[PDB]
Design a protein around this ligand. Structure first.
Ligand SMILES: Nc1ncnc2c1ncn2[C@@H]1O[C@H](COP(=O)(O)O)[C@@H](O)[C@H]1O
Ligand SMILES: [Mg+2]
Length: 241
C-alpha cells in the first residue's frame, strides 16, 4: 500500500475478530486512490482478507467509528460485501494513542508546487514552516531541500491531498505516507523521496468531535497506535458477503 512500513515492528497479539456490518461503520477521513486500488486488487486476487479493521463505538449512536480501515471499508463496499472482520476498541482508553501520517513524494517539486497553486493554495518559502506546522498554525509544511509554508487549515489540507492523489494517479509522483518525519528525512538522504508534508496530529477528542459533526479529515490524518498489532487473520473474501 501507500504507507511506509515501520522501522520497528511492535508486538503482535492474537486478538481475534468479530464480523461487523460495513453499514454500521462511520468514516472520519478521505481516501487515497492508490491505497483503495491496491486493497481491492490484493483482496480479490488473493481471496484472503488478513487484517482486521479497528473500530470504536460512537457515543450516542448505534455506529462504529472507523479507527483504521477506510480503504478496506470503501473497497469492500464497492465489491458488494456486507461485513468485515473487526476489533472493537475502547477509543478513550490510554491504550489508544493517535499521531499522524505525513504525505511525501518522489518527483518534481516545481510541478507539485504549480499544481498546488492552480488549486488555489499558497506555497510560501519560509524557513520556519516545519515548526509552524507542528504547532498547527498552517495546513502543511512542505519540506526537503527547500522549506515552504502552505497556510490554512482543514480545507487546505484537503486541497493539498487532492493534488497529491491526482498526481499519483497520473504517474507524475510516487506518493508515500510516513508515520515518522525522521524516517522521511532518512529516506530523503537516500534519494528514496524528495519532499515530505508536515502537519500537527489530531487529538482523539477532535476526531470524535469531527465524526459527530458528520465531517471528515483529509486522507491519513489519524495514525492510531495500540500496544500491539493484531496478528494476521485468515478470512476468505467470500465470507464477507
Ligand atoms: N488482502 C487484504 N486483506 C486485508 N487487508 C489488506 C489486504 N491487502 C492489503 N490490506 C491492507 O489494507 C489497508 C488499506 O488501508 P485501510 O483499509 O484504510 O487501513 C492496509 O492496512 C493494507 O495493509
Ligand atoms: Mg490503515
Amino acid at each position: 500500500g501507500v504507507e511506509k512500513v515501520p522501522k520497528y515492528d511492535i508486538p503482535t497479539k492474537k486478538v481475534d475478530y468479530v464480523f461487523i456490518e460495513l453499514d454500521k461503520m462511520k468514516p472520519h477521513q478521505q481516501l487515497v486512490q492508490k491505497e483503495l486500488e491496491a486493497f481491492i486488487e490484493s483482496v480479490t486476487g488473493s481471496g484472503i482478507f488478513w487484517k482486521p479493521m479497528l473500530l470504536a463505538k460512537v457515543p450516542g449512536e448505534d455506529m462504529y467509528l472507523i479507527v483504521d480501515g477506510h480503504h478496506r471499508w470503501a473497497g469492500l463496499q464497492k465489491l458488494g460485501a456486507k461485513r468485515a472482520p473487526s476489533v472493537i476498541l475502547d477509543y478513550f482508553s490510554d491504550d489508544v494513542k493517535v499521531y499522524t501520517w505525513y504525505p511525501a513524494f518522489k518527483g518534481d517539486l516545481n510541478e507539485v508546487v504549480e499544481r498546488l497553486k492552480k488549486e488555489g493554495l499558497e506555497v510560501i518559502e519560509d524557513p520556519e514552516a516545519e515548526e509552524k506546522a507542528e504547532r498547527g498554525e498552517i495546513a502543511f509544511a512542505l519540506v526537503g531541500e527547500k522549506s515552504f509554508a502552505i497556510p490554512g487549515g482543514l480545507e487546505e489540507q484537503k486541497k493539498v491531498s487532492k493534488v497529491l492523489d491526482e498526481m499519483s494517479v497520473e504517474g507524475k509522483i510516487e506518493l508515500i505516507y510516513y508515520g515518522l518525519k525522521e524516517d522521511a528525512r532518512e529516506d530523503m538522504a537516500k534519494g528514496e523521496i524528495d519532499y515530505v508534508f508536515i502537519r500537527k496530529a489530531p487529538t482523539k477528542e477532535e476526531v470524535m468531535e469531527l465524526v459527530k459533526r458528520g465531517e471528515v479529515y483529509s486522507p491519513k490524518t489519524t495514525r492510531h497506535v495500540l500496544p500491539f498489532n493484531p496478528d494476521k487473520i485468515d478470512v476468505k473474501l467470500e465470507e464477507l458477503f
